[model samples]
Target: YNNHEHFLQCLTTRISETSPVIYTHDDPSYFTVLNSSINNQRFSSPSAPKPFVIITPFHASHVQATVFCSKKHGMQIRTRSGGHDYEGLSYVSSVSFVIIDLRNLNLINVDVESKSAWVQAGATIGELYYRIAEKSENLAFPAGDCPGVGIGGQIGGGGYGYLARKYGLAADNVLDAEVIDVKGRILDRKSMGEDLFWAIRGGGPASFGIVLSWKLQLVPVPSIVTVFDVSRHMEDDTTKKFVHQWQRRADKVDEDLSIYGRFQTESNKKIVVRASFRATFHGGVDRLLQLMQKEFPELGLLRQECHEMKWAETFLFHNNFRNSLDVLLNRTKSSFKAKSDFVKKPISDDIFEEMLGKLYEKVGNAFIDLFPLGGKMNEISESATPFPYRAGNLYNIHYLVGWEEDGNITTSKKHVNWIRKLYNYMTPYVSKNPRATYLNFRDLDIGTNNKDDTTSSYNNIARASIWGTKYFKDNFYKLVYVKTIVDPTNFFRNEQSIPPLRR
Candidate 1:
């Protein structure tokens, strides 16, 4: 059972043939299952490291069996719900690992009476939304807008969406979870203890245990919600000035409204800068217009610009390109390299204009989506969950450079270099003193533990601090203590995973 083929042969004996299907290099569909959730083609290249075997567990028992067997055979297990991570660490491990693909376990049991649901990790956010919508249009969960995003990974990394301003994060609604520990024992939140429960929410959960499902507290959604997308180019004299005003009021405006902006440019010319201010309001058009006019008259949000729809329809509004609900479930490769930053203060008009100028100069194709933070997000204590970016932060900046080619490393490097240049230039504008990053974005540029094979804690101080501190901030130390308590062996790990304090 130590060798891959031999172990997989043994693996087949333990589970029903249809339950936990096993695949290896021998199977033609092996690559298909391997690449099934791979959103990033950069990792799908011929040079990328392939897992020893893929186990798509259909049941909790199958997951338990795989964990038990993988551990027994000393095989590193990479549990992936969605391979949408920016760095592609979900599936591509430098160390040879076995993949526990969780897509088959997707099942959602919505209880409209209890106002909660048991959502298996494998379900797509779209599936969950569709299920919830089928039950009641008034019930919704705070999650990523992308339909392809997996509930397991999304909740594991503190999921957020347009509902964030009204209801807080996706993780904030998670009352409990069912997890399979390193020892292959299934444990609920109460059994796993408060520390592990807290760590898995914002801290990367794969570094602790395999999440099977979540018991989510469903929040009330308005029967008719309003969504708007308004774009303005730099050529409009009002664009820069209007954006400056937006920075002053976005978070301060009505708690029922959230306007997330996408900043981009064709900017070889100064006039090519663009900003698309898209927003969701909990209430109807009238209220949203009032909020905008009272707080942000500069943006001039009008009733005509707002479209009223059911809570689920906003999903299509966020992704306007796709008309079919099935498209949300598509796993087709959409690849990108990215980094995250948090802003504590708004950039001045002059510096903001200069930053746009630099984007025009060096990076030809890139955009930063700034999601406003406050209201419920700000009301929550930073340490309430493991997601410390809660209070005090104005918004989070997700800088991305998208490319379509598989294994285009040279082209990737150029885009990455340009992105890094923009990142460095924004040093004066973004959060500093460890320069915080989002764990959900999963950037590897900040740090990794396996660069040299040396696992010495004293030796790799900077290695941990660079990315660890950015993702977790002061919570990194607490997360390390939690890891040390449960996984002293540090068997559950990835590039930016939480490290045990002593290891």
Candidate 2:
């Protein structure tokens, strides 16, 4: 039989007898599973991956089988979990491919006694947080705010979230990982060697291999924590003033505190700037309020407005929940696009105001998230892993645009263009000498490869030079080396996926 026929036969046999579970494109279960894995509604249509087949492997051996069959048949493979992939690269392939859906592998083993957990890649950060909270109110994991983001992609790219300033990134706390390499062998941190382990932690795993699970070190938090959000607008200049004062004191505040600024345009075409300052104090609300008063009185934060809850509850608050702590247990779909940049120095008031004005004119319903970086983050060295945006960097900027409806390609393109223009405009104020960017917030505009295998053009290599250095810095070379070693044929490739150096 040919490649496709061979795959069909193998899949039929596997589903009929061998594997734990299997869903093919023709199977009604296939669309349901694929749609559920895709968290972003924007890319849930027929234009998206429309996989030739979707397989949800329940065991490591099942994953191995899928990989073997795919390689044998010259078929491409894409791994997907909670598909909050900003660029939809996790599911969509430029060419024909099958999906290795890992959602059924959602298993988390929390050892409260050891204060660590072995979480499967398929579990959402919310599920992880919920499990941690169920174990103990004093323990929590430092992951992202979005409940639906898969642990697979997050840890693979150095996950950052609310507690990042206090405890460091999710990858920083990872004790070990179980990864399935190109050779179809399951390996951990020790077996993978320090080089591959180092690469996958933050260098983007698709460049190297498939991750099975991550063993994370949980951070401690008090039973009760304080969280609050305050908004400012351009008309009042409160945002400008608050941001100016925050730029000076935010990083200098207590290490237990974490504050994030959001710049966006409201539906009324008014630019709104908001800050959500949260502190997981080891003590009570009074102490947190006192700390804020002493440190950032200019923010006009009031003691009465703060809500006190457990550390996990505080995470829900920041994620935009109003009632029922159980809300953290549920996951929602979002249609969104995001990009990231690192800022070494704070933008001046004049320049900041100009940028806000530009955002006001550009598009409504877009947010620029400015997450302050310091405290524990500064203590870590730049070359620690592959995540080099450390120490000297003041903060990381995440540009986001989301909408409710779908199939509005024109509107989506317009919003994406607006963010691009805004990014271009801020070029002078941000990092330089390659202009750094975050790998997790994948952007095809930075660089892309021709999907056609028949073409021998150097497009992929040329584009890599433009954006690769920005995301990986000097570490980009080492990442390329790892890519060449593990996937030299570039089988696990995408538009902006890391390219193996031509030997």
Candidate 3:
């Protein structure tokens, strides 16, 4: 009567074993399949809890079957897309469960005339960009810079990128979606209804259903976009002043241009702190220089530093993919810890100096990113979708620390602790009324459900709201209402998933 044994037996009954889609602990390729999509090495350790079974489904029927079998056998389910889930909630679980890896479901179909595409959840953001470029250089979709990021998780959690200020978030561009619900029924936008549609757009679809594919509304890009990267060290004298001025003007500049800054410190004597400013303008270099001078003169952006390239090539440049467009398909793994925050007002120059001081304390592998938010981002209302961090937000601050894996707790704890302390230090300066966070960045420290909790009709709403409101704000209750109506039993869930409210 073991659930794992029964679930495996039931899956075999549903699908032919000759097709070979399911992998269990006994199979030689089980670990290989599991490790293939694990972007973060922290969850790949031998001591980490492994799923009872892994099912890489290529067809809709396979996903439906996994849902039915796992539910009937009393096993929890985790749906994974690119496995870039920062917290590893997509693939790891504390309780007995099975994984529905969507890697095989990747299929992108571009409609050049209509300016739309049907992208499966498993497709990487880079693949989507590559396909659109192959069709027409004038078309592009707004999303994160990472080429390896999966479409499902990125859009579900509200994607942010260079074009975000002009085109809005990746979630904002979605026109429709397809999902498999708790009852194992395939539902589309029209069939699932609007409430469900709103929840899945940026609300973390894993809480309501398993997303299959997204109907993307593509935006027009300039024939040639301009880009520039400039760096200044702490000793540059004007570096601190330049950073202060950037905070005041990055969001106020022309809508067609986006300028972001990253401050990185070194453990050695080569440099203390290096501030790098990069930008993407939807026009020629000459115009970009004018816009920089008019709005952000502090950076002193020179025309020589600017390069004009096709919109497609900018993806490679931003991702550091020096070789070929084909490198977008490669799934490389790394070890790191990350957290996020959104700012509505500018901080003083003195605080900027103190922030740089903190970076010098942690390992040299640490860096902080500042992404401008305005233009189209401000035009969209907060209630338009589950991602409520809209207007009044000047920019987003992301903190990250990385280390080469030592396969032990000592090294991992040191890096993770550094970021945690940094996050704590910035508390009073960031957003308030809940201290907002990005769902895509997925930090468990805010709040999480107990591992052994049951799937009740009302599953810890009060406890869940601690992290829910931070990610969703007032939209948290609306997401809960949708969850309660669609799946009151809470079938599809993770550590920070939205819980169904009580009747």
Candidate 4:
């Protein structure tokens, strides 16, 4: 078979014949499947690389065959789990490529006996949470709050969710992973070696191989938990003062408490700063309310506003649960983009004022999430995994600008520019000497790779100096070494994916 025909043939053999589920160019569900797999509207621009074929690999062997066939045919391959990549690097390629969508591979196996679970990369965080609840009321996993975020990319990028301040990151709790190597060999944590294991926890597996599944360590949670979202507008300076005070006390609070402050332009056209604090106390709500009352009284958290529910239900409430838990189970997809940062110190009130002013200038719907860091995150060493934004970090900031419109480059640029400017403004206040960034956010603005036509390693060199240092710090060198050893040819490459050593 020719390259095109060979691509389709591989798809037929791996998906149509053997896999339990299949969708192809000829299938009625083709367009729906492809569009659903798309995460970033920026990649849907006219300049983005449209793949020659897309494959939703349902089985481990299916993913294994994809790596083998794509390498054989010289077709670049992008692996997408939930399609939530900020750059859409997982689905869009500047060169002709194949998208190995992991949506169908989403299967959650909860081992309550072991206090763990085996989750396929394709599964969403919400689905994982829902499945765990179905199996046990007291069991839960510390992952992202976004119900739609795929476990593959989120965990791969060092996922830190509501429980991060307590249990640490999703990557921190990862027991093992099932991956298909560059040579199409299936390997786990043990076989892949500590070097490879370190690389994927936060270095991004797309640079090394395809992730099939993850063995996760489940954390225990109380049956009843407390949740509350308190809003303060710019007019009151209450939000500002509260956030400033929170910057001092949020991380210092007990691990059972997780407080996140969201700064955005609300629907009423006000510059609103809302701090949504939730706690999965080992005890009951009375204790939690008393703890908050004594510890963080600046926001004046009320007992009446707090809802006490099962840990799984608390997950739903934290994610803005309006109706049923079915939304957690629903796998319907959407297009979006996300970026991350680490703050070593709290932003001064002057800088906060400037940020609040700039919010109205940009698109109104953009969101900035501030995740408190400390607790277990502080206990872990910087080199525990490749994810080194531990220890000194005060919190992680996530910049999210998402829209359904895929073809509007101008609008997309506006959003992207706004974030870049916001990030720039935050320079003096955040971690410096190579300002730290969260790997999971996957921002291409820090640096990008060469297109298919270029042989130069300029992009790699530039990125290693810029974003590489921020994401990995000293561990960047070790990651590059792992890349050189595991994928010397750089077969698994993206604009921001780690590059192998220069020959």
Candidate 5:
């Protein structure tokens, strides 16, 4: 019997088709369903390997059945809640695989009584935020800026946002989680043990199992918060001077405030690079102005530059839009490549000028994102979770190069290489030894082994470390040990997924 056919037949036998169910090669809706959550258009090509089947399970038993059948049938499984995995490792694979899409599994229970909520892996951050607004104006969860980001991968990879300085990461606020093990058994924090629980929070849960949902701890927000976006130029040394000062002091600013610089090269008639300083203060404009004047007076921030709104509106404000809930819910598909770094020491003003020169001359579509990393980030111990780029880090750098669509290999290669060059350029200015990387950014250029050679990928902990250590630090080894105990056979694997150590 064909394995795919047998798996399909067995699946239907266990779970009724009446449930919001399966899409296979036979169904016309397969392509549409598969492409729905893929934010990166580069991975949505017709030539990419589509899974044998895409199963959107309605219940926990459905996922258990999927894990069992996929493992027994000798097919790989990619658990995709977000479909925002940079390399499309969550949805696309070269080998025969089945996608366990978690779209239908989203459910959120917000309790003002408990100051915590149970969020299904598939629930978008927007959904979570929208529901919280309905309950209380002062409650919020710290996560990525995008509303469409799935809580699954967001928490799994240590998500951070404007409130990250105060509340910590989305993962940091996670009180507990639920996962389905390789044995197709459901496990929670109590059953999974603390080691496995720690690893899953920041170590990419796909390597461990399918994380079904999260228990989120809500933080208090003010009735009104302040935000601003002020632009400065690179030519006059204003941008470089302000940004240089930020690297030295952004993290040192009050825990109630956060300010980061976004450097974008502008080219219309001439090439000009500008750094926009964007920020949020967790209080009234008067209080924010007082703090800015004392801590970061170089910008000459004024009352008019600051916009005050409800804490929820600040979410929309960051996206350069007003309080439009529709904008938060909106999704866009684009083609892009991105890499990351965490800086410990500030790059000099001279180096900043040189960096902007290269960016303007060679890369027109690239931008460098600078995110301050301290406040609560420093308060947490390095061993608190798998996310260890804490104290000592001045800021987190996200190097992104984006385009409109797919083309020949050369066109794609050129842009991807441009970002790589920029990453290489910043090498002297950022952290070293392991040359740190962010878990959420998830770039394959840092490292990867052969996916087709399963034997090599499974036991080769040494090889995985090339990129693994960069992402997780010393915790990479701990993640391997956790993998061995939880899923010894490496049933769940990907290009960048944590590997089981060689016995």
Candidate 6:
């Protein structure tokens, strides 16, 4: 037994003196490293299980040694990049485990001439944006709006944002990558081959290996991109029509313009729902207005509501870039639960009204987000990567509930139950067959490894497929095939990670 002691001893002998620091449970800084990048407060409870050892590796060798040692010592490994795993599977483990935190390894090198960048897995998307801005204003990568998400996790799970309509997902733009496999060897795109490389881009690399860095092909953005955030109260007759029309037209509008909506329950004299549309146009205000008028004129947008800024500035505060760019580096945490679904057909206005009504009756600190999926998204093949929710999908729907850190179980349960119920209510309208979900928004409620086992036998593939198919669709089988070959023993695994089919 004494896996921790053997694991630590193995690291000491295997790693170079220049290797990164290691923290044991007895160490004073153990808890600090554990909570450093934890974005969700729900899993930060003192009662939650902690890893046996925490390693913040700065070099590939450091990571390699940690992997080999953990595998040899009968201890599981959980890798943390930006620490934004919604389920906390990147850090917290049910079994004895070691955490290889990649924060120290974060180093982004942007090449303006090549129109690409090599970003370490530990680097946050915010950091990537900051670095890209330092070189060129017209160049940007299509990824999630949250600046704190790790480059590894975001692109690994099909990163999307306002630019997604003009350019595809961040994963789609990836030119190459550096990944450390189950054997602890560093391999690049040329060495990793097409299957595993495709798996990591969207299937989630954590299940197969630890991605060292990503070589992203930057997309072109206008020097001055137009942006706007407009709101409409649901009580207005046009608001309902606006939302209905948006679902159908947002994806069909000029590929240069992308508009996503959020339904929030506002507390005024009484509870009222406000629908906010935040959009970005690759061109100027005049053209955007023309496109909107011709395509979607339900809720008339005014000229005064729009602002034009450098593409990099768009990632700043929704309010403005006047706020220091340093805010992007700040790692903030909140207690929340989220679930995602891909909508194939336009949900009728009746369903939309009922869904908005739930926000008033249930948790007040919640909203429903609708991200449009067309243009570039429709052009990409479903099998291009493990992210198959392309083409026919009208848009993606995300359900979220957040609460302050009161840490009361009753309060957290209430929020969790409300989101789950909301998800169930919309089941009939969302994508069917599998009811597709976004992998980055990882939800354990849909399904987990059978009995939460680290290894999936041939028989357990059916159980694991429940959530796998939901996230990857038919592509799930290919991910399993790659996992079986790369990590047959399932050394790289978490509650929801891809399971190797053990004979």
The estimated TM-scores of all candidates read 0.94, 0.93, 0.96, 0.92, 0.96, 0.96
Total clashing residue pairs per candidate?
0, 0, 0, 0, 0, 0
Question: Residue pairs in steric clash, candidate 4?
Answer: none
Worst 10 residues of 2 by lDDT: 268-277
The residue-by-residue lDDT of candidate 4 on 71-128, one tens digit each, is 8778898988888787787888767787888988888999999999999989998899
Query: What would the per-residue lDDT of candidate 3 be over residues 1-503, giving only the tens digit for each residue?
Result: 55567778999888666566999898999999899888888998878889998998889999999889988987788988888998898889887888898888889999999999999998888888888888999999999878888899999999999888898999999988999999999999999999999899899998999999999999999999998888878657677777787787788878889988999886535547889988889889989988878777767788888889988788777766655664464443668999989988897777767877788866468889999998899999998989999899899999998877669789889888988988888887889887789999998988986456554535588788889999999999999999999988788878988888755
Worst 10 residues of 1 by lDDT: 323-332
Tens digit per residue, CA lDDT, model 2, 1-503: 33687886776564445443667666788788788877667788777657788878888877788777777777778888677777777888866788888887779999999999999988888889988988999998888877888888888788887788888888888899999887889999999988888888888887777889999999888888777776655456555667887776677678777778877665434445444444445457688778877876756777777788888887677777766765556553667777778888888988877777656654556777777888888998776777888887787787777776578889788877877888888899888876777777777677665555513425555567677778778887787777877777777776666777664
Candidate 3 Cα misplacement greater than 4 A, ranges: 267-271, 326-332, 451-459
Tens digit per residue, CA lDDT, model 6, 414-447? 8999999999999999998898999998999989
What candidate 5 gets wrong by more than 4 Å, as runs, is 326-332, 362-364, 452-459
lDDT of each: 0.81, 0.76, 0.86, 0.77, 0.84, 0.86
Higher-TM-score candidate of 2 and 4 = 2
Query: Which parts of model 6 are misplaced by more than 4 Å?
Result: 17-20, 319-332, 452-456
Pairing residues by index, what is the TM-score of model 2? 0.93
Q: Give lDDT tens digits, candidate 5, residues 1-503.
A: 34778888877777677765778887988888899988788889888889998999889999998887888788889888878888888888878988998988888899998999999998888778877877888998898877778889989999988998998888889899999999998999999999988988888899999999999999999999999988877675545556767888899888889887788888737878877888889899999999888877777788999999888777687776763564455342778899889989888878867877767744467888899989999998877888989999888988888887765667778888888888889898889878898888988899985555557644478788888899889999899999988988888888887888655
Which parts of model 2 have CA positions greater than 4 angstroms off? 14-20, 267-283, 330-334, 362-364, 450-462
Selected candidate, larger lDDT, 1 vs 3: 3
Total clashes in model 4, counting residue pairs 3 or more apart in sequence or in different chains: 0
Please tell me which model should have the higher lDDT, number 3 or number 4.
3
